[model samples]
Target: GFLVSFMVDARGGSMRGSRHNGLRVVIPPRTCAAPTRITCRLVKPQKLSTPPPLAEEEGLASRIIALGPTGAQFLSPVIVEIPHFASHGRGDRELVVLRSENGSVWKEHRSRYGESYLDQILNGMDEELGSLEELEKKRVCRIITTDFPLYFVIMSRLCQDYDIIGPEGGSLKSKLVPLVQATFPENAVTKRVKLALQAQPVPDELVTKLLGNQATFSPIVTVEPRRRKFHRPIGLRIPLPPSWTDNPRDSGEGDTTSLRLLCSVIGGTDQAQWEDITGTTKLVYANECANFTTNVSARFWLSDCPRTAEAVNFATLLYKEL
Candidate 1:
């Protein structure tokens, strides 16, 4: 149970401390989800006997350490970003890691040490743990540093707690905005970030009203018979909620998926346009009926537009013809 906090620097890379180097010095990955790992057998984690200026970094990840023959000698912190987890409350403070049991454990399953061994790992004591038999057979995992807290946007977004603060309770994001821009400039993501900060999904009552009014669609066809050739100017209308991104109640009005369904139905079929016709807010378009052929027959198909299962199921429950 350790109180660990890491911070990303003004460049969105890992922060460097006299006692630590950030994730940029560790693992580098751009993904939908990313975490770091490190491992090492601690010869000594804390240095109360020595001065603070000479303590080596500790780690919490997939780094495998090669131990010396007798006591802790050469396992320094070699870790990438470690793990995601939960914590249990106060002095019973716990660091919960979601590691699979199938993961490799060292041949030496236990750490044999002096009475003050656990004290050194938990507290900042200058003590050692491990038995002589536990030399090369030791398996090491997990290293944490003071820099973890500053990476809060990456760290605590899905974390149990939302404390993205400095040692004095200052907000960390005052420096995070510029760093995101410098680290990732390809997509102009900071624009989206601004939008994300400004808005949210729409209210349920309004969505219900919009859906209720146009829960049904009817095909309006006008066929023109010029002697033997036929022509039809087709008009179609579908009802839907407004763009949650465009016309929102607040930063909390987002229903982009709902508006997407009918949008596809219109555009996917024809050159659809939004307008008010005969008091109905409709998306109208034109399609050819019969031209230059005697084999043309009235045909409706399941392939006119692609539909999602949820939209199909919803229409079945609300507008199925009896």
Candidate 2:
């Protein structure tokens, strides 16, 4: 077990874990108003109270580092780098930073790092803290965060595929989940577009725990693009849940015979509204998976039943789906 603690004031400071050289934390200047004690620990898997589903299913790429003071918000984003053992190749898996306030509910932390150079110079930690490329070369992943609580790393085994899709029309598939696929027909777009696909199949037990006993869903997938609509309809294939065949309560207020496609468009903020589009979007069920033809660019997940009083809350969906 490795543990380290230090006081960081307005002058700023950086620290690294010992058992191995993989864990590092750099607090840039002006991040702390007064002297604050920051602690970092390399927590073992068994010690974690609430591990994310990704960690339980595929295991973690790096050790979970518990950073404190819990829920501390800094003036500026702090830089955290964790060394990973997973292969950083075009092969099917990629690393990501996962964070949690309580050990149980976790969210993937997407960062916009390496923006300013003045902070690096002022902190005087430039030599040890290299660019993201350099950190990747050292088998490390970097994340810039404003909140502190718990930090860890995980490798996504599914939907790590991406391609240059455009007028010629190319296709992409999830490396782990065979049913998750995106096919673009000819003239899908006027110019070449760089696109990536992220798909995660939720477990039946977890689906019930998060939503309800009767609730079930397809593999949540997202197509990378900011454009509201695509020039042509993109064909998406997603795997059906095991409980999709389960009958719902006859007295339920919403329809359960058919599946409802719920979409959340990530515009600018992290918050999004999941709207029902079963009436508008067209879906064909040939194989075990649900085949959808949609021109709208958004994160999509399929549910067997329509919207209800409990289904409209975005926070519940965000905690479980993400």
Candidate 3:
């Protein structure tokens, strides 16, 4: 006679009763066919502390600090050019400049004490702008100075172009129109600042063509115009290697192998443009999370098995698909 032993897991589907895998092999009556109910209690999880800031958090702060000085310098000329600065408002404007710097310092010092050097530069600008304002408003426009590194000189020049700043013209009001236009350009403000500053305006046709190239795998999942929502997911299918299914014993290895893929999407919209798309109803309102309606989403596929060359291949194929 052959005797086989099987162990029953105590932490099975139910938790309230003692497990049925002890030495006693309780058998029910032969005529019994009713259901048996068992319940189990789940152990509560331990509370966890808040996680520290991620790398992106520190990276974003550093980027803002690095770029703030450059933006401030560029805006100085614009501020001084205001007619009020030359009139009875000169003192007030000078004080405002000092106050802005002081405020900047106070804010930055709390978050980053080591970077308080920016306060010195801001203080310098306050004095420089004040001296220039004392001179002639006409000369104020020529006082633009930036602390951009030598490597970024070319990029700075491109960013200062009239295309980004808008078309140059006659009146002061006309000049300001372009300045306002260039203040923030599409996709150029974030990671593309250097490129946006350097390149001329891109044609819509080219943009459309480039985006269309990837439309095959890009399926639009949701298009809720009323909610201003757009979502897309891209997937890829790859054939498994012939050896993967060679033997029943090797199935575990095949199951443990998978591919890895990296993917990302770029999306944004102008605050003013949303009103036109959704009409005056305001489908998306800035600073109003409860009322938010506009959204765009993207997704990528990757094999979830452990690391392997097949996974890499799948990722490469998926990248091209994107």
Candidate 4:
């Protein structure tokens, strides 16, 4: 997104009777960007009478989704390249949201940042981003560098949405949580759960009404816990905790919940790779693909867990390095 320069090749081609030209950019492969992907799984939850203590739960606050310098467990920048196009008449770089026919989406703002769909992102102000459900549509959701901020805005807002602890004063509820994850954590918050019955059947509303500060909390539950697979290289499987996805039983997998992170960039130290992200679903300058989509190596399902906190804006960290 910084000083993106390209060369235009006016190779007139046949578009019906109209003439069309092509554009090509050639740069000695340098580490242009390194977009990333995150995946997570839910541990069996526990039923308790009150919200469990998070004395050591690193991602506890993240469960509720937060952004900014101190953002919660959310993908700061889930990047991918999108296609771009220029309006022949106006030369205006059109902004588009990759949406499917039946939209299942949300947003924080609506702003056109880049051309084509290469740089597409969310605008939650209208409560939605068009097209393609990143997860609903595909396990792989991509985004451009420019629209990363808005992507977090849309997702973090969802964290604050689940009123699980509502009337009960933010007490724990049965809402399945969904948030960004990585390969592994330096001090991975061991996700475990504990369940015990209430001392007395206390209503959530009563508990919410703190009396003499009598420990206003849920009295029936307190929580939090994956799998064996030969897919050792698969860093993590990002799935939408059912509560946030608002989707029931994916048509393809039928059982697995799908969640894909968006608003990110190509990641790596590969010098011969980069993306011409334009915010569109189609890949641009496809012949240049060899310079894109480089292989990333990893092991264990959570290999990406450590990356969860390393960055929020996918492109920012790599950009600063340059």
Please, what is the TM-score per model? 0.16, 0.48, 0.15, 0.16
Go through the candidates in order and give each one's C-alpha lDDT: 0.22, 0.66, 0.21, 0.21
For residues 1-322, write the lDDT of model 4, one tens digit per residue.
1112222122211111112211111111111233222211111214223322322211221111111112112222223322222111100011223211112232333334432442222221112223443432222222333222312211111112222211111122233322212232122222322211111112323323432222211111111111111122212222222222332222221112121122222222211122212222221121111011111221111001112232223223222222
lDDT of 1: 0.22
For model 3, name the residue pairs that clash: 15-39, 15-40, 16-39, 16-40, 259-311
Tens-digit lDDT track for model 3 on 81-174?
Answer: 1121122211001111111122122111111221223334243322222354343333221112222111110000001222221222111111
In terms of lDDT, the best-performing candidate is 2
Q: State the displacement of the C-alpha of residue 132, model 3, in Å, after optimal TM-score superposition.
A: 15
- Output the worst ten-in-a-row residue range by lDDT, candidate 1: 149-158
Ranking by lDDT: 2, 1, 4, 3
Winning model by TM-score:
2
Candidate 1 lDDT tens digits, 52-162:
121122112221221211121212221223222222111111222222112222111222332234333323322233442242123212332222211111111111222
Minimum summed lDDT over a 10-residue window in model 2 is located at 248-257
**Is 2 or 3 the stronger prediction by lDDT?**
2
**Clash count list over all predictions:** 34, 0, 5, 66
lDDT (Cα, tens digit) per residue for candidate 2, span 159-240 = 3346788798988887557878988889878888778766765655555656665456776677765345778889998876
